The first five atom37 places (N, CA, C, CB, O) and aatype in JSON, in Angstrom:
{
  "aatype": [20, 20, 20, 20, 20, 20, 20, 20, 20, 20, 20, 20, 20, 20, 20, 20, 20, 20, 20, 20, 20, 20, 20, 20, 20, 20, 20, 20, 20, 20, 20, 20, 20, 20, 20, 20, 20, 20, 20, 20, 20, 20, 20, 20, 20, 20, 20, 20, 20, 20, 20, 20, 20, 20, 20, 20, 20, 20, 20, 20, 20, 20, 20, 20, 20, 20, 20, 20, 20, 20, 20, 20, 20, 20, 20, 20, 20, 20, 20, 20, 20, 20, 20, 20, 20, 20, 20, 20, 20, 20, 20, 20],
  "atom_mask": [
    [1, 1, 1, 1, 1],
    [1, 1, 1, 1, 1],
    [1, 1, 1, 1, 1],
    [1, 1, 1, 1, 1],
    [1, 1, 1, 1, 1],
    [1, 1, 1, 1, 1],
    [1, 1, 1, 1, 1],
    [1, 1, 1, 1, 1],
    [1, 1, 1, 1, 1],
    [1, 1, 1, 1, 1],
    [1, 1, 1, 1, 1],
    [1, 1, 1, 1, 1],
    [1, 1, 1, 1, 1],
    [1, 1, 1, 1, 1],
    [1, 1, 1, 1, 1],
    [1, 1, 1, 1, 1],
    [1, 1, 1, 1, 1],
    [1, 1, 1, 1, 1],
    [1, 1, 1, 1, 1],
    [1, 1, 1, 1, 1],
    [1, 1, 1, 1, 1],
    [1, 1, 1, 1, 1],
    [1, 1, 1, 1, 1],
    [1, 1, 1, 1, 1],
    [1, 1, 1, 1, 1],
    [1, 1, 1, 1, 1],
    [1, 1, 1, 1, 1],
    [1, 1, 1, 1, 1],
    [1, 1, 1, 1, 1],
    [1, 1, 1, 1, 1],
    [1, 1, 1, 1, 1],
    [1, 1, 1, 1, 1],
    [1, 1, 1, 1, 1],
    [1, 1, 1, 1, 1],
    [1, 1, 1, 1, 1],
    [1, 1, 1, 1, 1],
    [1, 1, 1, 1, 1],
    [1, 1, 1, 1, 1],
    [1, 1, 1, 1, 1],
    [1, 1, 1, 1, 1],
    [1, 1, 1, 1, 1],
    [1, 1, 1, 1, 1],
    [1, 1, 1, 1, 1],
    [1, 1, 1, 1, 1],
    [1, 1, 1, 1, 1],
    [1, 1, 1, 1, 1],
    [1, 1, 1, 1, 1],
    [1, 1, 1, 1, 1],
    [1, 1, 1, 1, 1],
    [1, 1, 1, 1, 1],
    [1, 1, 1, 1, 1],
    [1, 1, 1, 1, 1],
    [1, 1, 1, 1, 1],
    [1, 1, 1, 1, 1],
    [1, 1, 1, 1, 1],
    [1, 1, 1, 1, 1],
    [1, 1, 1, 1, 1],
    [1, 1, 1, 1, 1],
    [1, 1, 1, 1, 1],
    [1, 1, 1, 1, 1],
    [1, 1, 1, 1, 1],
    [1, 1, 1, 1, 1],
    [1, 1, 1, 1, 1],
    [1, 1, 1, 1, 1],
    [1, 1, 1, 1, 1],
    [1, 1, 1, 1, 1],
    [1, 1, 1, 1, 1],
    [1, 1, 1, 1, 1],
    [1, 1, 1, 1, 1],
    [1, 1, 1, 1, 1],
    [1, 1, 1, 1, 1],
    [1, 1, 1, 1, 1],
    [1, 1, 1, 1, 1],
    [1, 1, 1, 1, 1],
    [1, 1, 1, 1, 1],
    [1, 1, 1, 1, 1],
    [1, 1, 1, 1, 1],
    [1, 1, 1, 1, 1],
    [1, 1, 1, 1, 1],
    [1, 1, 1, 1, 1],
    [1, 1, 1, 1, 1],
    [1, 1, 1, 1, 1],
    [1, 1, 1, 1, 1],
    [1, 1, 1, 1, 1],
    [1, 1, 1, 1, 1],
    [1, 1, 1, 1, 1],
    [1, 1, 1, 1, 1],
    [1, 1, 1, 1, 1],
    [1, 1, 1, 1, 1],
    [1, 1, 1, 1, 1],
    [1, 1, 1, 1, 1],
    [1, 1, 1, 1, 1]
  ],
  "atom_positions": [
    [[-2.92, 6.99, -13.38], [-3.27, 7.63, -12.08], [-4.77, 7.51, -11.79], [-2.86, 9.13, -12.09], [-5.25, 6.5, -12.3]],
    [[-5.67, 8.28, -11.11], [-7.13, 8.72, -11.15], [-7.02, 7.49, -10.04], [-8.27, 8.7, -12.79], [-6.05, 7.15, -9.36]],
    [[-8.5, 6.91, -10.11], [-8.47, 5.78, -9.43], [-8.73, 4.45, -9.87], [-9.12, 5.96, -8.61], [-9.53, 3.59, -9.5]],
    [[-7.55, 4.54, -11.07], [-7.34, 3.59, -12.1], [-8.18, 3.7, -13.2], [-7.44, 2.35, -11.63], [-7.86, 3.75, -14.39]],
    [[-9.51, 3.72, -12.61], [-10.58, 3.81, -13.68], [-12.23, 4.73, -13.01], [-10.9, 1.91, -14.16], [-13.01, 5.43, -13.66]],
    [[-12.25, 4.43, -11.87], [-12.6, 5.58, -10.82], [-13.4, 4.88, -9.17], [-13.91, 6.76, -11.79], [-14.13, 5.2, -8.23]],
    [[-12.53, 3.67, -9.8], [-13.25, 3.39, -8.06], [-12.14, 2.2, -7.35], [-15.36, 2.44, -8.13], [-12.38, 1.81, -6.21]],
    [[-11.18, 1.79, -7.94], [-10.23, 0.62, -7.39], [-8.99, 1.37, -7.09], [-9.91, -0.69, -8.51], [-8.64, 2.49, -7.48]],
    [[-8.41, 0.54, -6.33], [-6.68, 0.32, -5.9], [-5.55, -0.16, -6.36], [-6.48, -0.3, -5.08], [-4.66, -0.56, -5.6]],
    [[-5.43, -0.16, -7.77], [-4.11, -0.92, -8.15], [-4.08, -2.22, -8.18], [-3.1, -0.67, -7.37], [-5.25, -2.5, -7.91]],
    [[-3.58, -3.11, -8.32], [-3.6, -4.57, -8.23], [-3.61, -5.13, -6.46], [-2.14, -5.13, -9.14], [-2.6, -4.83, -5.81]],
    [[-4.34, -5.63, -6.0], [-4.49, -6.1, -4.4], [-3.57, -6.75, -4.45], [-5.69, -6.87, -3.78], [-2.99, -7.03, -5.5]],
    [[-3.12, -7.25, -3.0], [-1.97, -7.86, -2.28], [-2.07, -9.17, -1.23], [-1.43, -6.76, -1.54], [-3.26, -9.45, -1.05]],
    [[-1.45, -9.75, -0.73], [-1.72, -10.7, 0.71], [-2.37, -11.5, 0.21], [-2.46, -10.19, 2.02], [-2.26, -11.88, -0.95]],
    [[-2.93, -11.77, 0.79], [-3.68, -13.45, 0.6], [-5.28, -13.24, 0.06], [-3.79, -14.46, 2.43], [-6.3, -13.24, 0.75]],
    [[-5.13, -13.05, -1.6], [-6.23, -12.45, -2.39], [-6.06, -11.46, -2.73], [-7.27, -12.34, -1.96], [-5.52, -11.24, -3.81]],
    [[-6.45, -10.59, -1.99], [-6.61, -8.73, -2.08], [-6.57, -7.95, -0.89], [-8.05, -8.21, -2.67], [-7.14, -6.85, -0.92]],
    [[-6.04, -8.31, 0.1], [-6.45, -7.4, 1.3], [-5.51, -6.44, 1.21], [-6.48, -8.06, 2.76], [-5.52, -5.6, 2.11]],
    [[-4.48, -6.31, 0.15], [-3.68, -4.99, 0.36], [-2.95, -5.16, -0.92], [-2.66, -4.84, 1.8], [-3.24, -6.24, -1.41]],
    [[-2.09, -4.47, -1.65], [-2.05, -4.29, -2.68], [0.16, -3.79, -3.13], [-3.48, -3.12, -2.8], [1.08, -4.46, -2.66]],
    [[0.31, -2.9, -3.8], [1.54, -2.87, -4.43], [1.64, -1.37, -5.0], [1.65, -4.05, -5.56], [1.09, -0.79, -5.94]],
    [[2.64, -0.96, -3.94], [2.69, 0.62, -4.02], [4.27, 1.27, -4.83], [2.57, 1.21, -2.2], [4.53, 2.47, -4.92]],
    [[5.05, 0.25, -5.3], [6.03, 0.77, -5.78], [7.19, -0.64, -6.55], [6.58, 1.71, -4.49], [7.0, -1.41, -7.48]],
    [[8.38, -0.44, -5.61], [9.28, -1.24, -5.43], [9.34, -2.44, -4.67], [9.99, -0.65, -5.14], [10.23, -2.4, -3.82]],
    [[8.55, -3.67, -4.7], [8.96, -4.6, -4.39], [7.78, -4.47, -3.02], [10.59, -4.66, -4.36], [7.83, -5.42, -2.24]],
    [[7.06, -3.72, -2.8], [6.61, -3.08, -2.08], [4.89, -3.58, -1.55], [6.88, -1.86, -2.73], [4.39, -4.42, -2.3]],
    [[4.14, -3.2, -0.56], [2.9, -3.94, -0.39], [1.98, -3.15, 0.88], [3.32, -5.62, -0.02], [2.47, -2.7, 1.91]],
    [[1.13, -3.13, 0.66], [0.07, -2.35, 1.89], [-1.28, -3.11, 1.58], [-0.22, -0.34, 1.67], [-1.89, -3.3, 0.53]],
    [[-1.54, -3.56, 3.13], [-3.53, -4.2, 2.95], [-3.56, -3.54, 4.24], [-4.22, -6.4, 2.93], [-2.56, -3.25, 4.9]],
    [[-4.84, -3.3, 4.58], [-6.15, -2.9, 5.07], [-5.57, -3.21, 6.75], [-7.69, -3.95, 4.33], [-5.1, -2.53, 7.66]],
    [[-6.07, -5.31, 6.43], [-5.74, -5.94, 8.05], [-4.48, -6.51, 7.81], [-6.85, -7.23, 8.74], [-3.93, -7.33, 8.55]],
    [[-4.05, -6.07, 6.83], [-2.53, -6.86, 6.34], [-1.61, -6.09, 6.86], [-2.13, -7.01, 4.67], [-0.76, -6.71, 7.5]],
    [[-1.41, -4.29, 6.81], [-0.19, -3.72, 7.47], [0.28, -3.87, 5.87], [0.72, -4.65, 8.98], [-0.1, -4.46, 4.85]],
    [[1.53, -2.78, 6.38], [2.37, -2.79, 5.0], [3.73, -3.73, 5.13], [2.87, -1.13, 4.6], [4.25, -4.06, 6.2]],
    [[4.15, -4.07, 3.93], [5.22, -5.09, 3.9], [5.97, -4.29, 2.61], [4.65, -6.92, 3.64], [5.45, -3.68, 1.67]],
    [[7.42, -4.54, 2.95], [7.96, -3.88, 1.64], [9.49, -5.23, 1.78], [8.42, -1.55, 1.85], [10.38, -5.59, 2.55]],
    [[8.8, -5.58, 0.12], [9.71, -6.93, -0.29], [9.62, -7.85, 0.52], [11.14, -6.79, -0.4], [10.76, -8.32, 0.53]],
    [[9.01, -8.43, 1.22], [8.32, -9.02, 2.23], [7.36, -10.56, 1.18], [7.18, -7.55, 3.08], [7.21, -10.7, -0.04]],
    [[7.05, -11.17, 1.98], [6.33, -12.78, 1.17], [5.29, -11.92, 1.11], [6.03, -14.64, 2.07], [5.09, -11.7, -0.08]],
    [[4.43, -11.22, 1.86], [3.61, -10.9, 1.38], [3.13, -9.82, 0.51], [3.26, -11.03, 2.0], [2.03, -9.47, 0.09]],
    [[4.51, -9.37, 0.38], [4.9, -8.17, -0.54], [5.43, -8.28, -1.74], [5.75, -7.42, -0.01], [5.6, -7.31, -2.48]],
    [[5.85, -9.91, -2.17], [5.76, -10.12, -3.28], [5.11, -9.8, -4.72], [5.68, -10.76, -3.04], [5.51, -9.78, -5.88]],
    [[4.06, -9.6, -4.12], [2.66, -8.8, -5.48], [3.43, -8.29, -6.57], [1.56, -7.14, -4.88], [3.26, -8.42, -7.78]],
    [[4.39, -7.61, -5.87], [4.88, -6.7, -6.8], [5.31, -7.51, -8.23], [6.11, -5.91, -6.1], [5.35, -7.02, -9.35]],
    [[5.56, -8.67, -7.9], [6.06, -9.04, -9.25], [4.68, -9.48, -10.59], [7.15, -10.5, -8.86], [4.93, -9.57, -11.79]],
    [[3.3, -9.68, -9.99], [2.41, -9.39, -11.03], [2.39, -7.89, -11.28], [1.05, -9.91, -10.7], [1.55, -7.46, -12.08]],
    [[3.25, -7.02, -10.67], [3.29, -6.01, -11.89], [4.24, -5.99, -12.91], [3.39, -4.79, -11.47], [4.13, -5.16, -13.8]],
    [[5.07, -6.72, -12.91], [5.56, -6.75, -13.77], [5.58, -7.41, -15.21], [6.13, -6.82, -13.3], [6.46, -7.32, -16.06]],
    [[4.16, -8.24, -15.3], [3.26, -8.17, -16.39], [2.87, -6.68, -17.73], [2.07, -8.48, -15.52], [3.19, -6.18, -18.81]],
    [[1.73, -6.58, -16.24], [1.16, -5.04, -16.99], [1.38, -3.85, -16.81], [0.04, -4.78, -16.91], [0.95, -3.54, -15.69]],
    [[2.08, -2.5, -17.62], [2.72, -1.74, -16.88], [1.36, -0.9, -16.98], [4.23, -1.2, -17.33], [1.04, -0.1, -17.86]],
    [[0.53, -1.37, -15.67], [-0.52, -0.18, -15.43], [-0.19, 0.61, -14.23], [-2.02, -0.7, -15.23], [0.57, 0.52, -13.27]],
    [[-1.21, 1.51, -14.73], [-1.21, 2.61, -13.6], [-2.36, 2.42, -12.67], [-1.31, 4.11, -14.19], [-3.01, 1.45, -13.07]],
    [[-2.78, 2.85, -11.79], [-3.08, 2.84, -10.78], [-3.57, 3.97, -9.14], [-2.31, 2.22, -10.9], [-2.66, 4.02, -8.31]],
    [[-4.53, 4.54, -8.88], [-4.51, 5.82, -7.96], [-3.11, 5.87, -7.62], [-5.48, 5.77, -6.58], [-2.27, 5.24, -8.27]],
    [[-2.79, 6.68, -6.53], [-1.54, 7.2, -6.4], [-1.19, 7.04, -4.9], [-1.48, 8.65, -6.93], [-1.68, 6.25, -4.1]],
    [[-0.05, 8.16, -4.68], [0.22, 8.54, -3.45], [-0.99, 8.59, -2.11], [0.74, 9.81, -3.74], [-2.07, 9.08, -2.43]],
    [[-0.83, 8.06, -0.52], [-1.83, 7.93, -0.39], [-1.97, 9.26, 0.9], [-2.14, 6.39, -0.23], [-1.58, 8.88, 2.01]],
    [[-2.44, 10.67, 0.85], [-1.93, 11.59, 1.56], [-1.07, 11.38, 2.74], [-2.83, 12.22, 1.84], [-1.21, 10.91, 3.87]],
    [[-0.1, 11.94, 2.03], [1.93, 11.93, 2.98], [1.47, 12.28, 4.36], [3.53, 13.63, 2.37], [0.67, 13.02, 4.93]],
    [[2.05, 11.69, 4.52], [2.61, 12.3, 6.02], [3.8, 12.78, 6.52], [2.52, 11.51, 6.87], [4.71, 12.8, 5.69]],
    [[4.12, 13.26, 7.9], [5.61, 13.76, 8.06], [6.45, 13.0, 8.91], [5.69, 15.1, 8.6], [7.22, 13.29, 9.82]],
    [[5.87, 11.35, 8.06], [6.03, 10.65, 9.2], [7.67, 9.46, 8.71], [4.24, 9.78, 9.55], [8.26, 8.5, 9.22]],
    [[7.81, 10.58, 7.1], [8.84, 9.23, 6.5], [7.93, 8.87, 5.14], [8.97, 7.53, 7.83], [8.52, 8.09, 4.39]],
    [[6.57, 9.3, 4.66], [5.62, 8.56, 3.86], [4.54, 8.9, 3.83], [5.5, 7.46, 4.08], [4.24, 9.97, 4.37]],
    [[3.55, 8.11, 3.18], [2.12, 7.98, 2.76], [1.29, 7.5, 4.22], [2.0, 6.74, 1.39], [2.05, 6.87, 4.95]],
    [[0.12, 7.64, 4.69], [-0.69, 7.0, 5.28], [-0.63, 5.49, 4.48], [-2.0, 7.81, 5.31], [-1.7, 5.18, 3.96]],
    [[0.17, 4.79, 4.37], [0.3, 3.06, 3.6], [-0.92, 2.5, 4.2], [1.89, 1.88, 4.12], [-2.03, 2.77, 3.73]],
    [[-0.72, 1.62, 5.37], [-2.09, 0.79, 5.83], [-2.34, 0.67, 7.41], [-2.01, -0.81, 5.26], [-1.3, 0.82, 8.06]],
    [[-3.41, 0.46, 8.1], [-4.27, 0.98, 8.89], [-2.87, 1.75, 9.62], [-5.38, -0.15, 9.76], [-2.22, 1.09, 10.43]],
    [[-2.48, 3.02, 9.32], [-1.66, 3.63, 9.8], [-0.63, 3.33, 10.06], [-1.92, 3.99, 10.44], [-0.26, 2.98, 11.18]],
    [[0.57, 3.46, 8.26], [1.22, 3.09, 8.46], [2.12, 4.65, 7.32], [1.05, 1.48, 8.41], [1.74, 4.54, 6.15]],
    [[2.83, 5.53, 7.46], [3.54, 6.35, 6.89], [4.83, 5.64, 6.59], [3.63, 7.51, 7.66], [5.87, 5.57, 7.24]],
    [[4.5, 5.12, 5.39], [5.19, 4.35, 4.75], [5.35, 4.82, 3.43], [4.72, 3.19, 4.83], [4.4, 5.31, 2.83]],
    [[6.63, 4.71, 2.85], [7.03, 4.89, 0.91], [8.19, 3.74, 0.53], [7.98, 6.84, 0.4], [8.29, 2.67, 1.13]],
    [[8.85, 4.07, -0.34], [9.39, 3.09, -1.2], [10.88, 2.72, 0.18], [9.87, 3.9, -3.18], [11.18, 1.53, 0.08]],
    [[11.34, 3.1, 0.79], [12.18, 2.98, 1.57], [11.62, 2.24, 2.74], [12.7, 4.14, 1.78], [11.91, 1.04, 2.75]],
    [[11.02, 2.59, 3.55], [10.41, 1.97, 4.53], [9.11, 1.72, 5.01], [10.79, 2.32, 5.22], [8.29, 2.15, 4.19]],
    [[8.57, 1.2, 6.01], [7.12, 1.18, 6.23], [7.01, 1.42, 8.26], [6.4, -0.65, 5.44], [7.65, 0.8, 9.11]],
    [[6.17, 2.29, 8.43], [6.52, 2.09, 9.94], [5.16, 2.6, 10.59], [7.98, 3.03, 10.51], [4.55, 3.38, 9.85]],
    [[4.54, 2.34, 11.84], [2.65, 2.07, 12.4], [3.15, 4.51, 12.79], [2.17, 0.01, 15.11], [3.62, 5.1, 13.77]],
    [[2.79, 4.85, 11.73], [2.66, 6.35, 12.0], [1.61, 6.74, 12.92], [2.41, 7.08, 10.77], [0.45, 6.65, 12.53]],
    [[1.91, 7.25, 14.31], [0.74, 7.57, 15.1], [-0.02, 8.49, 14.22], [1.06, 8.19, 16.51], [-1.22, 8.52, 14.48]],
    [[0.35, 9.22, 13.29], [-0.6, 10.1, 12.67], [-1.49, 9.75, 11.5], [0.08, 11.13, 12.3], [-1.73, 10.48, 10.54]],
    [[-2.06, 8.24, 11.74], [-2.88, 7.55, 11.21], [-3.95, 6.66, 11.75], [-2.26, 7.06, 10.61], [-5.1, 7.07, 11.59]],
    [[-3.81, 5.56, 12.34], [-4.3, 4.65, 13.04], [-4.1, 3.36, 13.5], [-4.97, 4.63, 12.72], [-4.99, 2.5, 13.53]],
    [[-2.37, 3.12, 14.02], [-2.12, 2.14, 14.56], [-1.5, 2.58, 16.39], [-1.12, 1.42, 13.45], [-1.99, 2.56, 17.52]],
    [[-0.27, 2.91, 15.82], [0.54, 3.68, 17.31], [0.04, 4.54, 17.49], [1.93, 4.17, 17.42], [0.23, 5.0, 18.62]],
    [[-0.88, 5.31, 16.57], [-1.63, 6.64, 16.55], [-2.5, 6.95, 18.09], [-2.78, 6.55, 15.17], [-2.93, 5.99, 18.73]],
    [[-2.61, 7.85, 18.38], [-3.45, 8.61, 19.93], [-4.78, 8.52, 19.4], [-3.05, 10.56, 20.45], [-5.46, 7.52, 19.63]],
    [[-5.28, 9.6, 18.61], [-6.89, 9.86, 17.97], [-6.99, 9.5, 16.73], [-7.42, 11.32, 17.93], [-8.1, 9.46, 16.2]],
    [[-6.08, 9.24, 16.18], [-6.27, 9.39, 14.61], [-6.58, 7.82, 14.33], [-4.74, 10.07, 13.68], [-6.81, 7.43, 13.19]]
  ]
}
């Protein structure tokens, strides 16, 4: 858990690192959006190398999920642009 070691994200995702691997098959970057089992959500399978850990949950929302990526309340089931973040979002 922590933030792995106290300043990173888990193993990055997409094309390099722009987003990373939050569970099951699963994927969130920055300008990437989240993908779950998706080509670019593939990542997931360099975890299945090292069974590390990694920060965590990324504060839930009541939106279905986590704030995933640039506003996306997303978890292991689905991924979707949560206005209560910063995509479909009003202010946030």
């Amino acid at each position: 858990a922590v933030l792995d070691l106290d300043v990173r994200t888990c193993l990055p995702c997409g094309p390099g690192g722009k987003g990373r691997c939050f569970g099951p098959s699963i994927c969130c970057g920055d300008e990437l959006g989240c993908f779950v089992g998706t080509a670019e959500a593939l990542r997931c399978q360099e975890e299945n190398y090292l069974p590390s850990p990694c920060q965590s949950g990324q504060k839930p929302c009541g939106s279905g999920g986590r704030c995933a990526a640039a506003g996306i309340c997303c978890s292991p089931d689905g991924c979707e642009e949560d206005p209560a973040c910063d995509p479909e979002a009003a202010f946030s």
